[PDB]
Amino acid sequence: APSEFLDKLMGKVSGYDARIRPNFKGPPVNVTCNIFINSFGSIAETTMDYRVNIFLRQQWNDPRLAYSEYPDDSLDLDPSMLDSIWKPDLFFANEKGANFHEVTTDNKLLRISKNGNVLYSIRITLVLACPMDLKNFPMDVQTCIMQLESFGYTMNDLIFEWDEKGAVQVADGLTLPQFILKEEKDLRYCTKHYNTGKFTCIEARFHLERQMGYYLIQMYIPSLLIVILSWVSFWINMDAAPARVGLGITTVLTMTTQSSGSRASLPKVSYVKAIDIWMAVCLLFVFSALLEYAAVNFIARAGTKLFISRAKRIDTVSRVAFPLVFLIFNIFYWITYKLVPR
Template sequence: MTAEEAANMSTSELLLKLTATCRYDKWQRPQSEQKDQPIKVHAKVHVYFLGAIEAQSLKFTAHILLMFRWRDPRLAIPSGSGLDGRVGSSMGGQGLLLRDKIWVPHVYLSNERESVVMGAERKDVRITLHPDGRVEQALRMKVTLYCLMNLQKFPFDQQQCPLMLESWTYNSSELQLQWESTRPVTVNSELLLTEYRLIDTRTTSTEDTEPLLTAAEPTHPRLRPNDSAIVMELEDEEDRALEENEGLRANFSRLEIRFHLAREVGHYVMDYFMPSILLVAMSWVSFWLDPNAIPGRTTLGTSTMLTFITLTRNTGSALPKVSYIKATEVWFIVCTGFIFGSLLEFAFVNTIWRRKKEVPLKKVNSKYILKSTLTPRMARRQLQSSLSVGSELDRCTSWPHQLNQSNANQLTVHSMDSIHIGNGGGGGGFDSCDTLTSAVSAPNRLDDDCLSIQIPVPGDQSGKLEGQALPPKPSFTTMTPQEVAKWIDQRSRLWFPIAFLLFNALYWGFVWI
């Protein structure tokens, strides 16, 4: 077609002339400007709207304008025809008709669930031809795309939801998808999302390796039992075919947009985390109630637990069932542990409150109170063993000899049949509860029936024994079970809040990193 012929034609006539089947084959891809090079198709996307991102079904909806641009030399207008700018622009049904007459790249959304070209009476498709052979195609589409989400930090998670464009018919050696050099992706400036906020969009251009051919299921005709040789030959041929087809793979050009989305946490903080913190703190009110207030403390603990479980069920109902632990589940487990711990603390102090025997203590501190409370028999056994020496001496009936006045710090025993410790001469002696800890001198055998033993006893020098101080007497005290129960409640008022504050510091530090 000459320039004079093109100048005398209308736009419709020119389009029909250019796309006539006698000179244009729509099934053959255009030749590249450089020989043996793939044709380059430039893409651009405008995002009108991003719908709700459904975590339950791992999908999101978008309204987009998808634009492609490539050059087809067969549609170029001869120079000097007097046509400037665009040769023609066809929209709606006419755009579909024109698209059916020319070659267009077969590009699909590889992560789409469903898609549709928008438009009520006429589909929103536009085809534009330029005199130099450039072709522009624009489609307004509604697409539902899959988005594989990582919900480990829910609701403080950030998602990367992709929109992937990939060539279907031609591999990367025949067709190359490229983003436009300037602003390949634009987003509606008034775009607002309900649960997420759009942080940014990133574009990438990659290649995807896919099998070019897939082997079909082997089928054999019905053979007789004695045809085993034929069966083996057919199987060998199929194995060779599979080995040959295994290497038939090709790279397909791919364009990808990643929408970086961050979840808005205001709703979850106000409707889940703050109420759960208040419920945990409410369970601590039982520490200020009387340990014997069974109805009040039991009702408070169980009602707090049931309310918290109901609150959690409403929060996680819209999430998919995943195999890993989410941040909300960690929060739920720990808060449940604190509420249940307050119930266990009440059961513990109420059990102590109802005891009858006093609790013996070596010292009045947390270590010995808890040890004596948890193992009361062991505490009493230790008390009895420390006083065992004095108790044994108490069971003696008589003391046969008086202390020697001239040697007040020593006494001689000539008979071991019966010993009774009383107040010796010089005012130094042991009472029935004292513990005998001084060393006994080596026995001097006088005869078969007499044994002489020298036992040092306290003198008058303020409890001094030959320059050495006596070991201190073990001091023991006791607490009533009611005093122990109130002591545990007082400590719980401090321990539980401190532990919960430490957990919050670790938890919020983790989710915000």
């Protein structure tokens, strides 16, 4: 009897056809699909893509599946039965490849309401290639988008609509080590025009903000320290050229290395990153320090002690100048990027 009902509803009997669209030659089937995202992982600037595995819940009703037989409002069909019924055909457009998880049983959940409402749920792993603007790199906000489109049928045949309440849910305990996701999530329609015809698509937005802890600790602090080293360099007498030339050279080299280190993590990009203007100014200051020492030597290795007194003056006034120029730059710098954002 219970098997007999799976056989009666879905059997060849009643002439049910998998291939034919529900309510065919008529109003477009409306699919309400909401996604529950388990995790973001392996977000890489260089690879340019981010991994997310999601439950996809799509709901479409067809009149023909509706049954008067059982008391229960919704009956849970077997996962295999699902291969038999018509399914809405939905591919991630930017998907860059994706896979089901078939571990143990195939992971799929389907249930038919007596009304004829169908609930269909699948667990997918997605790699998604999102374009991301690095115009200001360290502290930027990046938007990651996923758009679900129907490759099979045109606009008149099929439509996608987000669920009116709670269209995208996130894991209760989900955190990203590198970025923080924002509670506010934008959802917006799109319509794709292709040579073949117009295909429906719906896209979610995700907003992610870069954690400043790691970059502060790694990128900025050593720069600050190295810049301190020039400052301590100034106090040593000009008579010892090696100590000054040694500090200047060593510091400029280290700044070079520190600068490349930032570059290795990132994808190769034409426009100047904020990190680059920071490195350019730090390097400009150490180079200017060595430059000042060079000028002091040009005056000192030249001649008369009156000039050497002049140079002992420029030493003090310089040592007072550099922390001020660096500090004022720093102040002027932080406001634009980390304050009044967007």
